[PDB]
Design a protein around this nucleic acid. Sequence first.
DNA 1: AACACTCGTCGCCCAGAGTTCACCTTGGAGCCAGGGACGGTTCATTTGGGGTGCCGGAAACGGACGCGTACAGGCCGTATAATGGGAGCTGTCACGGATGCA
Length: 88
Amino acid sequence: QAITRAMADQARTIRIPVHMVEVINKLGRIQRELLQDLGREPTPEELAKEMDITPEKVLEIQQYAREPISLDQTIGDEGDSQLGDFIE
DNA sequence: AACACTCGTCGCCCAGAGTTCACCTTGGAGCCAGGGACGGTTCATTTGGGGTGCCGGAAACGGACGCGTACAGGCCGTATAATGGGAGCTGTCACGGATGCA
């Protein structure tokens, strides 16, 4: 319990409430189970059927789950300049 | 090759084209005199009309005001036993100097 609560409260650059992290992890887990079972990836409507909630909220959860990237990671094929040198 | 006729060309002579030179009339062009009616002006009405400020009040209307409901985020607890990480890939060289050992 302590480890999972701390993961939810501290693992992400943008804090996500545990009530939303739980649904994100559950969605990912059962979606990978569905992919393994069915042989293809599950579509958002199919995943919403298991979430017992609407595909709009499924998509909102999906776009919420994304994490930021570093402004200083090298973007070029070689190491020449940082991503921060491309942002207006 | 010898012989006896009819036609432009010019001058001249008389009459008017039409033009000038040069004479009488009479409709003037206008100048003024006189008399409207007239249209521009002004001033009396004239009450037909615009006007209005406010309200009884009727009804919309804008909002306050109190009290219900709604997911979002947070806290909390799950009692067989479960008792020391994977993974990292590392071809540089120069080389000054500290540095842990000499």
